[PDB]
Amino acid sequence: SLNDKIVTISCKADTNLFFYQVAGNVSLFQQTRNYLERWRLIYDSNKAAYKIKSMDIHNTNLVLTWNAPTHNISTQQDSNADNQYWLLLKDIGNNSFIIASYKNPNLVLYADTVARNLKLSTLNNSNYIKFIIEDYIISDLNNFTCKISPILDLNKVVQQVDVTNLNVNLYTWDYGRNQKWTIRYNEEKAAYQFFNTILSNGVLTWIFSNGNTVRVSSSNDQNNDAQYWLINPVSDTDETYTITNLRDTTKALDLYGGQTANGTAIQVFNYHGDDNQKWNIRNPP
Amino acid sequence: NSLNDKIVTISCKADTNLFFYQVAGNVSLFQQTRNYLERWRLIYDSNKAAYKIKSMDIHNTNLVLTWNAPTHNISTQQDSNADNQYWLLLKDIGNNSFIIASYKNPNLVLYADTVARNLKLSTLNNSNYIKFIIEDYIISDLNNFTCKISPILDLNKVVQQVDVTNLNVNLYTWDYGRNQKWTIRYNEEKAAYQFFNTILSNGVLTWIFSNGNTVRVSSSNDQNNDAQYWLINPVSDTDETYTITNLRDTTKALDLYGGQTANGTAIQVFNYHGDDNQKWNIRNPP
Amino acid sequence: VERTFLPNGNYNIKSIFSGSLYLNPVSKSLTFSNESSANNQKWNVEYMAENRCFKISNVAEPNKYLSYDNFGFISLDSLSNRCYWFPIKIAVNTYIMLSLNKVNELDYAWDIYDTNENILSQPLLLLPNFDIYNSNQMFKLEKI
Numbered sequence: 078s079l080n081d082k083i084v085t086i087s088c089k090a091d092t093n094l095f096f097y098q099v100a101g102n103v104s105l106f107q108q109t110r111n112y113l114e115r116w117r118l119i120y121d122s123n124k125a126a127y128k129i130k131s132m133d134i135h136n137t138n139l140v141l142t143w144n145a146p147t148h149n150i151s152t153q154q155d156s157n158a159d160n161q162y163w164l165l166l167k168d169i170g171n172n173s174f175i176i177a178s179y180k181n182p183n184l185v186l187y188a189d190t191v192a193r194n195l196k197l198s199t200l201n202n203s204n205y206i207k208f209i210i211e212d213y214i215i216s217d218l219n220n221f222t223c224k225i226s227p228i229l230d231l232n233k234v235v236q237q238v239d240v241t242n243l244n245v246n247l248y249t250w251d252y253g254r255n256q257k258w259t260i261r262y263n264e265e266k267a268a269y270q271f272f273n274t275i276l277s278n279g280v281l282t283w284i285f286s287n288g289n290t291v292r293v294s295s296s297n298d299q300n301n302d303a304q305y306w307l308i309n310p311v312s313d314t315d316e317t318y319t320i321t322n323l324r325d326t327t328k329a330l331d332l333y334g335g336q337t338a339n340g341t342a343i344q345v346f347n348y349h350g351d352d353n354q355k356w357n358i359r360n361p362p
Numbered sequence: 363n364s365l366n367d368k369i370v371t372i373s374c375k376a377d378t379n380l381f382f383y384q385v386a387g388n389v390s391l392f393q394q395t396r397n398y399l400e401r402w403r404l405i406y407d408s409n410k411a412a413y414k415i416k417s418m419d420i421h422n423t424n425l426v427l428t429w430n431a432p433t434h435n436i437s438t439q440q441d442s443n444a445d446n447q448y449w450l451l452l453k454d455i456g457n458n459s460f461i462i463a464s465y466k467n468p469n470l471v472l473y474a475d476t477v478a479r480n481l482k483l484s485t486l487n488n489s490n491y492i493k494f495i496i497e498d499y500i501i502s503d504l505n506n507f508t509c510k511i512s513p514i515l516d517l518n519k520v521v522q523q524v525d526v527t528n529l530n531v532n533l534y535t536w537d538y539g540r541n542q543k544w545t546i547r548y549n550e551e552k553a554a555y556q557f558f559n560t561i562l563s564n565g566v567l568t569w570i571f572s573n574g575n576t577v578r579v580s581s582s583n584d585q586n587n588d589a590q591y592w593l594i595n596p597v598s599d600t601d602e603t604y605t606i607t608n609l610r611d612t613t614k615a616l617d618l619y620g621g622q623t624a625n626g627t628a629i630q631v632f633n634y635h636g637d638d639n640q641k642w643n644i645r646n647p648p
Numbered sequence: 649v650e651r652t653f654l655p656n657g658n659y660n661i662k663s664i665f666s667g668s669l670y671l672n673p674v675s676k677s678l679t680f681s682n683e684s685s686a687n688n689q690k691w692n693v694e695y696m697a698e699n700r701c702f703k704i705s706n707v708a709e710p711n712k713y714l715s716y717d718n719f720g721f722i723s724l725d726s727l728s729n730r731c732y733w734f735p736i737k738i739a740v741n742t743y744i745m746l747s748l749n750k751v752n753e754l755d756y757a758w759d760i761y762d763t764n765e766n767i768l769s770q771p772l773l774l775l776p777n778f779d780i781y782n783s784n785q786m787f788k789l790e791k792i
């Protein structure tokens with residue numbers, strides 16, 4: 078079910094530390110939103126266990142390896158060995174994983190947060206053996222404060238007009254908080270919300286009851302589909318996406334007519350995949 | 363939390379015909395019984411992040427799965443919320459099985475001794491003997507169950523396919539014909555069921571939505587038609603009574619036409635109101 | 649002078665899964681490796697009468713004793729109450745080795761995981777013991 082997913086792996090005992098890899102050395106390190114902390118899970122169904130392969134661009138063949146019999150964990154060349162297979166055991170209710178060696182299932186990964194590396198331990202109730210395995214896109218975008226620029230004009234961005242005017246348009250980047258969005262992933266609903274930083278609970282929303290108009294409204298109401306969006310990566314890119322609405326996934330976020338003029342409208346429109354429906358989600362400089 | 367308060371059957375990945383069975387404080391592995399002897403309530407403690415596994419025994423009502431430390435034995439004892447009465451449910455993703463570890467001592471997990479037909483605690487290995495299938499008790503009971511379906515207005519009558527070539531479905535007195543028997547199959551991807559009439563290989567109960575409320579059987583050779591799938595929901599206080607709604611549109615219920623109990627009365631779908639003519643006993647054939 | 653069923657002195661230590669593999673330290677773990685004829689595969693067993701247990705030190709590192717850590721592994725460490733072992737002799741040269749102290753209020757014992765009788769590269773662990781029938785907890789002590 079998780080086969081071929083590219084994920085980040087972070088520590089329950091410290092959710093700011095992620096499995097990090099360089100030149101064969103595995104460590105625990107802050108969030109990088111890049112390949113150094115991205116891993117592909119490769120399922121072997123006979124063993125009912127996973128290889129955990131680094132997405133390193135320079136060496137493409139490294140997998141998480143237990144240097145049995147030592148306490149040490151590293152990455153080595155994939156030789157399909159027992160010490161490079163792992164059981165992914167999800168602790169239900171707790172929403173975390175225990176990661177046990179296929180070579181010796183009595184031993185599981187242990188996060189030594191003080192040494193910033195991985196060790197092994199027999200099973201126990203500590204958080205230091207618990208891990209958060211997350212689709213890498215969700216990992217990078219969740220709680221990320223960003224600016225949203227159309228592919229057609231990068232020096233401009235999607236903005237709320239001001240703290241009282243809740244409409245949303247295109248305007249040149251000026252570092253204003255009305256031009257920045259904090260992305261929250263809703264696990265219950267498998268979709269994202271965009272919180273404008275000029276407000277406390279103002280989310281990008283598709284005002285269905287008025288055609289294609291999108292504004293920001295309060296996130297207070299318990300159930301909605303217009304308030305939520307799906308973010309999908311355009312392949313061959315590292316920061317471009319399309320943004321489709323949860324209510325109706327055929328409706329994508331659209332820059333009115335492809336016009337890159339200040340004040341141009343932003344509204345949901347039928348998905349065509351053209352350049353006026355592609356958005357760079359970026360770190361604010 | 364997703365498992366909290368769920369009533370489940372627990373069976374062995376190493377022998378899927380053996381289920382956790384409870385009686386008078388003893389826990390054993392037994393064939394499927396489709397009844398309370400093999401039913402357990404999973405009870406979540408959020409502080410411990412672990413679960414009690416409570417027996418649905420009808421006589422002794424406070425019995426939970428218990429590790430008899432310092433031995434390796436397992437029994438059911440009075441719930442006192444002790445650590446040896448708590449368990450971690452670790453789902454082995456991709457294998458659809460659980461390792462069930464003692465909260466008291468996670469070095470130790472449940473181990474199925476299929477030869478003695480009981481359970482003990484063990485350190486870990488890669489065998490199926492420490493792997494278990496935890497399943498909602500309704501799905502467990504109904505999956506691969508060959509049944510007859512009788513309306514509760516007349517338990518002597520049954521839902522039948524007319525014959526091998528006439529695919530209409532109507533109500534008729536029970537005559538033990540294979541045309542009057544259906545095998546239920548759960549589809550985990552669609553989270554819904556199909557009813558296969560046993561007089562054919564691939565004929566399933568289907569709402570013919572291109573013709574009002576008519577239901578007939580049609581081949582399952584059709585790939586993606588939600589009209590062939592159904593949700594089966596128990597009516598509370600009952601062991602065999604259900605409502606049967608269509609996956610295409612869950613507002614539509616299996617419905618005995620007019621509440622008429624005469625031979626030949628039509629079986630259809632209809633807007634769900636939960637009256638007696640939308641209630642069905644799913645039963646073992648005598 | 650002999651106080652017990654297991655004389656003081658130097659021993660090789662082996663799993664019953666193999667007559668050709670020998671207990672030695674590799675980094676901070678303990679494991680069973682090919683015959684080296686060296687002192688790191690020689691273990692000095694010494695009876696402590698006060699508490700009726702045995703201390704087992706490595707002859708290449710005479711002030712290090714077989715012990716256990718907080719992660720489930722057997723270790724080579726300084727003297728402490730974790731270095732006390734309570735053997736159960738179950739045959740001529742075959743023993744189960746319990747920690748003197750109850751751990752997690754159970755008997756715990758040396759334990760070596762096998763894969764179809766192969767133990768290569770496995771660390772020696774400390775795991776629950778319930779009886780004298782666990783193959784992965786049976787070890788041979790050979791005078792040498």
Ligand SMILES: CC(C)S[C@@H]1O[C@H](CO)[C@H](O)[C@H](O)[C@H]1O
Nearest residue numbers: 331332333334335346349351353
């Ligand atoms: C000149 C226009 C037809 S371009 C047209 O405008 C539409 C307005 O809703 C949408 O934005 C489309 O994406 C765009 O191609």
Ligand SMILES: CC(C)S[C@@H]1O[C@H](CO)[C@H](O)[C@H](O)[C@H]1O
Nearest residue numbers: 617618619620621632635637639
């Ligand atoms: C006397 C009738 C209106 S009762 C009526 O018949 C319908 C026939 O489609 C359905 O079976 C309804 O469930 C039922 O209430």
